[PDB]
Amino acid sequence: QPAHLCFRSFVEALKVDNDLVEINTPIDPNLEAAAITRRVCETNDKAPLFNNLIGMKNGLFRILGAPGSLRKSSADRYGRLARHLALPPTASMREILDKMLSASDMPPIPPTIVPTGPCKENSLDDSEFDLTELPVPLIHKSDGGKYIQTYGMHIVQSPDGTWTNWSIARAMVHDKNHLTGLVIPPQHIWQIHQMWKKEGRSDVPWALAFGVPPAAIMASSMPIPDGVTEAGYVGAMTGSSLELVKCDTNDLYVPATSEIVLEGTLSISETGPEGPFGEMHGYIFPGDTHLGAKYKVNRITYRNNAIMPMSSCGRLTDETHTMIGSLAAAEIRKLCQQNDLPITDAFAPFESQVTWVALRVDTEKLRAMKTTSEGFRKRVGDVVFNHKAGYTIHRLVLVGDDIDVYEGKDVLWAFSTRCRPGMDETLFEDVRGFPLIPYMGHGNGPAHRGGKVVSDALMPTEYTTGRNWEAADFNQSYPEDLKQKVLDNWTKMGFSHHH
Amino acid sequence: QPAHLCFRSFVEALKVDNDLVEINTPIDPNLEAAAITRRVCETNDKAPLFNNLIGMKNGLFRILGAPGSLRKSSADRYGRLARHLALPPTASMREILDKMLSASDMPPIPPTIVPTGPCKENSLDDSEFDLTELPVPLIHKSDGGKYIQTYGMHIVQSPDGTWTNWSIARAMVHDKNHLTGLVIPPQHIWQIHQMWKKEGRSDVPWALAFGVPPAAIMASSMPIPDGVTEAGYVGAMTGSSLELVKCDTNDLYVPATSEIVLEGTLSISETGPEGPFGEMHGYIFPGDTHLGAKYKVNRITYRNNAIMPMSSCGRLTDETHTMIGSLAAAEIRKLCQQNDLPITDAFAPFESQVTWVALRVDTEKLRAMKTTSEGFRKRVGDVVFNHKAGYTIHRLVLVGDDIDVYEGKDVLWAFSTRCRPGMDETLFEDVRGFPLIPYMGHGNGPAHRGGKVVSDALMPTEYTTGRNWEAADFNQSYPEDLKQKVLDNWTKMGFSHHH
Numbered sequence: 001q002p003a004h005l006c007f008r009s010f011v012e013a014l015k016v017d018n019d020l021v022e023i024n025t026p027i028d029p030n031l032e033a034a035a036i037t038r039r040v041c042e043t044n045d046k047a048p049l050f051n052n053l054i055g056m057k058n059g060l061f062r063i064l065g066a067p068g069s070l071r072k073s074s075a076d077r078y079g080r081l082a083r084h085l086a087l088p089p090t091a092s093m094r095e096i097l098d099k100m101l102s103a104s105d106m107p108p109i110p111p112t113i114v115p116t117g118p119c120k121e122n123s124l125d126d127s128e129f130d131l132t133e134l135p136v137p138l139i140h141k142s143d144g145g146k147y148i149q150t151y152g153m154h155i156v157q158s159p160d161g162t163w164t165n166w167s168i169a170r171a172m173v174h175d176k177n178h179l180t181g182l183v184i185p186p187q188h189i190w191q192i193h194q195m196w197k198k199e200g201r202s203d204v205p206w207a208l209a210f211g212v213p214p215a216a217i218m219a220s221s222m223p224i225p226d227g228v229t230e231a232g233y234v235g236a237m238t239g240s241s242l243e244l245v246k247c248d249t250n251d252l253y254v255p256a257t258s259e260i261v262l263e264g265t266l267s268i269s270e271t272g273p274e275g276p277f278g279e280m281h282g283y284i285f286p287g288d289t290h291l292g293a294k295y296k297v298n299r300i301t302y303r304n305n306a307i308m309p310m311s312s313c314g315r316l317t318d319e320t321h322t323m324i325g326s327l328a329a330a331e332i333r334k335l336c337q338q339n340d341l342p343i344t345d346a347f348a349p350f351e352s353q354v355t356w357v358a359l360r361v362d363t364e365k366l367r368a369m370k371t372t373s374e375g376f377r378k379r380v381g382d383v384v385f386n387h388k389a390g391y392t393i394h395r396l397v398l399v400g401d402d403i404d405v406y407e408g409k410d411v412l413w414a415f416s417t418r419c420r421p422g423m424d425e426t427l428f429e430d431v432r433g434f435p436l437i438p439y440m441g442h443g444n445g446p447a448h449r450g451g452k453v454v455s456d457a458l459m460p461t462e463y464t465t466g467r468n469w470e471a472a473d474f475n476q477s478y479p480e481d482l483k484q485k486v487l488d489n490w491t492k493m494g495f496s497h498h499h
Numbered sequence: 500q501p502a503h504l505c506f507r508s509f510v511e512a513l514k515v516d517n518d519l520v521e522i523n524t525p526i527d528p529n530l531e532a533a534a535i536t537r538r539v540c541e542t543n544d545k546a547p548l549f550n551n552l553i554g555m556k557n558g559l560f561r562i563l564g565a566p567g568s569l570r571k572s573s574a575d576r577y578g579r580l581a582r583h584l585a586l587p588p589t590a591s592m593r594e595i596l597d598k599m600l601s602a603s604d605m606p607p608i609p610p611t612i613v614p615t616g617p618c619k620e621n622s623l624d625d626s627e628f629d630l631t632e633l634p635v636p637l638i639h640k641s642d643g644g645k646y647i648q649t650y651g652m653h654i655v656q657s658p659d660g661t662w663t664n665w666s667i668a669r670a671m672v673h674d675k676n677h678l679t680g681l682v683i684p685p686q687h688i689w690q691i692h693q694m695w696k697k698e699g700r701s702d703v704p705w706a707l708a709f710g711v712p713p714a715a716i717m718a719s720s721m722p723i724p725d726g727v728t729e730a731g732y733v734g735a736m737t738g739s740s741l742e743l744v745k746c747d748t749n750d751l752y753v754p755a756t757s758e759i760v761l762e763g764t765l766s767i768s769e770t771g772p773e774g775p776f777g778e779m780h781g782y783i784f785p786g787d788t789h790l791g792a793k794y795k796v797n798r799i800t801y802r803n804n805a806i807m808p809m810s811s812c813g814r815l816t817d818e819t820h821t822m823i824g825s826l827a828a829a830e831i832r833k834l835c836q837q838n839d840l841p842i843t844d845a846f847a848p849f850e851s852q853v854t855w856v857a858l859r860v861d862t863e864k865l866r867a868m869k870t871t872s873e874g875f876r877k878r879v880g881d882v883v884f885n886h887k888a889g890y891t892i893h894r895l896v897l898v899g900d901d902i903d904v905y906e907g908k909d910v911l912w913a914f915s916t917r918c919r920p921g922m923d924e925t926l927f928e929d930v931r932g933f934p935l936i937p938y939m940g941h942g943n944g945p946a947h948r949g950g951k952v953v954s955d956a957l958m959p960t961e962y963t964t965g966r967n968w969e970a971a972d973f974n975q976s977y978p979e980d981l982k983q984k985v986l987d988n989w990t991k992m993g994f995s996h997h998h
C-alpha cells in the first residue's frame with residue numbers, strides 16, 4: 001500500500017528517507033519515550049520508533065513519535081508532512097496546503113467497504129483488555145493522566161447518518177475501560193455530541209483509530225466545513241476511495257489498515273476528570289484538572305506488531321504547530337477568498353506559537369476596492385473570527401505582496417515596521433476565543449470570548465496608488481548586474497542547498 | 500595602542516581574529532562597497548576592508564564596512580562589539596551592556612590634551628579639498644546623496660562650554676564644502692544646536708571625526724544623560740583618560756588617533772536637501788527628500804592611509820540594530836531601576852527590527868508591590884516613553900523571570916502566549932514618536948506623536964502568588980535524571996559549541 005494510504009507503509013517510507021531512528025532496546029512509556037520525542041521535536045531530528053516499549057504485551061504496542069514534525073534541512077523541512085500526502089519530500093508549504101485544499105471544489109469520493117483488513121488481525125473483548133495495563137505514555141511530568149490519544153482519529157456520526165466526522169481531540173485513560181477527553185465547542189466532535197444529547201436516547205456510537213492512513217490524519221486535523229464527511233474529502237484529495245471495515249460492536253467504519261482501533265461509546269451524560277496536559281502553546285498548569293467527556297471502550301482490534309503514533313506536544317516544533325496552525329491557515333485562506341477578500345496566501349507563523357495568521361493581500365485587487373484600513377480590517381476580522389476556521393487564531397496580520405507569509409522573519413519584519421500599535425489595529429471582543437492560550441484560560445479576561453485582533457501591516461499607499469518604498473536590503477537596494485557581480489566574486493574575494 | 504582606544508589597532512584586531520577580508524583590488528564606492536557590506540551584514544560574514552577604493556587620492560580613503568555587525572558563530576556572535584570595549588570575544592550581550600553602563604555610577608575621567616597625534620599627519624585647507632571629489636559611498640541605490648557620515652562622531656559643545664557631546668547622526672555630501680544631515684529632537688546634537696540658535700550670535704563650532712576610538716563610538720551611539728560629556732564617560736568606562744588634540748580651526752578637541760577629521764560649523768540658520776536614506780528599519784522611500792541641517796567644512800585632517808568606517812544599514816543585521824537598539828535598551832534598564840521599577844534586564848529583539856524592548860521583571864519584587872497589570876504598565880510606560888532613552892522604542896514587552904530577553908525566540912514565545920491583545924496592553928498616544936519607523940512617518944497618524952504601547956506578558960499569578968505553570972519543553976517537563984539519561988544516550992541511540 002502506498003505511504004499516504006497506509007500507516008505501516010508510511011513508517012517504511014520514513015526509514016527509507018533516513019528520517020527514522022529505530023530504538024530496539026527497552027524504553028519506558030513513563031516519560032522516557034516522550035522525552036526523547038520532545039528533544040527530537042525541539043531539534044528537528046529523525047522520528048523515533050520505539051520497538052521495545054516497557055509494558056508491551058501481546059502486541060500492544062510500539063510507538064512512533066514526531067510523525068508530523070520538522071526535518072533539519074531547509075530543502076526537505078516539511079518532508080514528513082509531504083509523506084502524508086504522496087508529495088515529493090521537497091514540497092513547499094504552499095504545495096502542501098494547496099494539496100489539503102484541493103478537495104474543496106471536487107466531488108467527494110466516498111469510501112469503499114471491504115470485509116476485512118489488517119486492523120482485524122487481533123482482538124480483545126471487554127473481559128480481555130485493561131487500558132491501565134497497556135504501555136500508554138505519560139507525555140509530560142505534570143500531566144493529569146496517560147494520554148493514549150494524541151495522534152488517532154475519533155470517528156462519530158450524526159444521528160441521521162448523513163455526516164461522519166474524523167478529528168483529533170485529546171484523550172487520556174480514566175480506568176480499565178474508559179477514557180476522558182476534550183470535547184469543546186466549536187469542534188465537530190462537540191457539534192455531533194450535541195445532536196445526540198438533544199435526541200437524548202443513547203450514548204454516541206464511537207471509534208478511535210490509531211495509525212490511520214496519513215492522508216486521513218491530515219484531514220482529521222483540518223477544519224473542513226460543517227457537515228462534510230472527511231472520508232470523502234480524503235478520497236477526492238488522493239484520487240482514490242478509502243477502504244474501510246465495519247467495527248465489530250457498532251456500525252461505524254474504520255480504515256482497513258488502522259494499527260489499533262478502540263470501539264465503544266461517547267457518553268451523553270457522564271463526565272470525568274481530564275487534564276492538565278502539556279499543550280500546543282508550550283505550557284502545562286499543574287493541577288488544573290476539569291471535567292471532560294467520558295468514552296467507554298468495549299473492544300480493541302489491532303494489527304500484528306501494532307504501532308501507536310504519539311505527539312509529544314509543547315514548545316516548538318511539533319504536530320500541533322505544523323498541522324493545527326498550517327491547516328487552519330489553509331482553511332482561512334479559502335474562507336477569505338470565498339468571501340471575496342483579496343487574500344492569496346495564509347500561514348500561522350511558528351514564532352507566534354501558531355496564534356497568528358499572516359494573510360498576504362493582492363494589493364492590486366485591494367486598490368480596486370477603494371477602501372481604507374479601518375474598513376478592510378473589520379471586514380477581514382468579521383469573516384475569520386466569526387467562523388470556526390478562525391477559532392485558534394487570535395491575531396491576523398495583513399501584509400502586502402512583497403511578504404512571503406511562509407517566512408516568519410519576513411512576517412515579523414512587516415508586523416514590526418508597518419503596523420502602528422493601536423491605530424492600525426481592530427480589537428474583537430465579541431467573538432469566540434481559544435481558551436487553551438494561556439492569556440485566555442489563565443489570563444485576566446473571559447476565557448472563551450474576545451482577545452482577538454486584526455493588525456494591518458499594509459502601508460497607506462497599498463490601498464491607493466501602490467507601494468512607495470524599496471527595501472534597504474541586498475535584493476532591492478542594488479541593481480541586478482551589481483548583485484550578480486558581487487555573488488560571482490564572493491568566494492574569490494575571501495567570503496563564505498540540500499544540506 | 501589598544502584596540503578599544505585606537506581604530507587602526509581595532510582593524511588589526513579584526514584581522515588577527517580572522518574576522519576581516521582585505522579586498523585589495525579596485526572597488527567602486529558607487530554602490531559596490533556598500534553592496535558587499537550589505538551582503539556581509541545579511542549573512543554575518545567577516546568585515547570587509549576596502550584597500551583599493553576607486554577615487555581614492557592622496558590618502559583619502561580606504562573603507563571598513565560592518566564595523567559593529569555580527570559574527571556567524573553563536574560563541575563569538577558579538578565579538579566585533581566586544582573588540583570595541585576590551586572584552587573577550589565570547590562576551591555575552593549582558594556583559595557588553597553592563598560594560599556600557601558601568602561608567603554611570605563612576606566619576607568621569609576627563610580627557611587629556613596632547614599636542615599632536617596621527618590625525619594631524621596630513622591636512623587640507625579650504626582651497627585644497629572638494630567633498631564631491633572624495634570616494635564617498637553611495638550606500639543604497641535610491642539614496643538622495645552620498646552618505647559620508649554613517650559611523651563617525653559629531654562633536655559639538657554647549658555655548659557655556661560645560662557639555663561636549665559626541666554622537667552619530669547621519670550626514671551626506673551637499674557640495675564641495677558642505678554636508679546636510681539629520682538634526683532632530685530629542686537628540687543631543689539638536690539640543691545643543693537649539694542653545695546656539697537661541698543665543699543667535701554664531702554658527703555652532705563643529706567637528707566630525709571618523710575612525711575614532713572604538714569605545715568612543717560606542718558611547719557616541721548610547722543615550723547617556725543630558726549634560727554628560729561622553730569623553731569623560733568613556734574615560735571612566737575604560738579606566739583611562741582619552742587623549743585628544745585641538746582642532747586647527749576651532750577650539751574643539753578630537754581623538755588623537757582619529758582617522759579623518761572634518762572641522763567647521765553647523766549652521767544656526769541654513770538648511771539644505773537631505774535624504775532619503777536606506778534606514779535602520781529596512782526601508783527607503785525614494786524621492787522623500789526634506790530640508791536638513793547644513794554643515795560647512797573648513798578643514799580636513801587625516802592619518803596616513805586613512806580608513807573611513809561605513810555602515811551599510813537596512814534589514815538585519817547591522818550597527819543600527821546591534822548598537823542603537825541594544826544601547827537604548829541598556830539605558831532603559833538603568834532608567835527603570837532608578838525609578839524603583841523591578842527590571843533586571845532589557846534588550847531590543849532583532850526580530851522586532853529593534854522597535855521593541857523586552858523588560859525582564861524580578862517578579863518577587865513585583866509581588867511585594869501588590870499592584871496590577873494596568874497600574875504597572877502605566878507606570879513603566881510613563882517612565883520610559885517620556886524619556887529620551889525611550890525615543891526609538893514603540894513597544895515594551897514585560898516578561899517574567901523565566902524569559903531570557905537576549906533570546907528573541909523566547910521573547911516572541913512569551914509575547915504571543917502571555918499578553919492578551921488589547922486587555923493586557925496600554926496604548927500611549929501623547930508621547931514622542933520615532934518618525935523613521937515607516938508606520939510613523941509614512942503611516943496613518945501623526946509622524947511625531949504616539950503609536951506606543953506597553954504589552955504585559957506577565958501572567959496573573961506573577962503579580963500575586965508566583966508562577967503557576969511549567970513549560971511543556973524538554974527542560975521543564977522531565978526530571979533531571981531522565982534528561983541526563985536521554986542526553987547521555989542520544990548519539991548511541993542514532994540521533995545527531997565553538998563552530
Ligand SMILES: Cc1cc2c3c(c1C)C(C)(C)CC=[N+]3c1c([nH]c(=O)[nH]c1=O)N2C[C@H](O)[C@H](O)[C@H](O)COP(=O)(O)O
Binds near residue numbers: 167220319
Ligand atoms: C494535530 C493535532 C490536532 C489537535 C490536537 C492534537 C494534535 C496533535 C493534540 C492531541 C496533540 C492535542 C490536542 N488536540 C486537540 C485538537 N482539537 C481539539 O478539539 N481538542 C484537542 O484536544 N486538535 C485540533 C483539531 O484536530 C482540529 O481543530 C480539527 O479541525 C478538528 O476537526 P473538526 O474540524 O472535524 O472538528
Ligand SMILES: Cc1cc2c3c(c1C)C(C)(C)CC=[N+]3c1c([nH]c(=O)[nH]c1=O)N2C[C@H](O)[C@H](O)[C@H](O)COP(=O)(O)O
Binds near residue numbers: 666
Ligand atoms: C550606530 C548608529 C547610530 C545612529 C545612526 C546610525 C548608526 C550606525 C546611522 C548613521 C547609520 C544612521 C543614522 N543614525 C542616526 C542616529 N541618531 C540620529 O539622530 N540621527 C541619525 O541620523 N543614530 C542614533 C544616535 O547615535 C543615538 O540615538 C545616540 O543616543 C545619539 O547620541 P546623544 O544621546 O548624545 O544624542
Ligand SMILES: [K+]
Binds near residue numbers: 166219220223224230
Ligand atoms: K477534521
Ligand SMILES: [K+]
Binds near residue numbers: 420424459460938
Ligand atoms: K498599517
Ligand SMILES: [K+]
Binds near residue numbers: 666718720721722729
Ligand atoms: K551619545
Ligand SMILES: [K+]
Binds near residue numbers: 917919923956
Ligand atoms: K498578561
Ligand SMILES: [Mn+2]
Binds near residue numbers: 225230
Ligand atoms: Mn469535521
Ligand SMILES: [Mn+2]
Binds near residue numbers: 665666723724729
Ligand atoms: Mn549625549
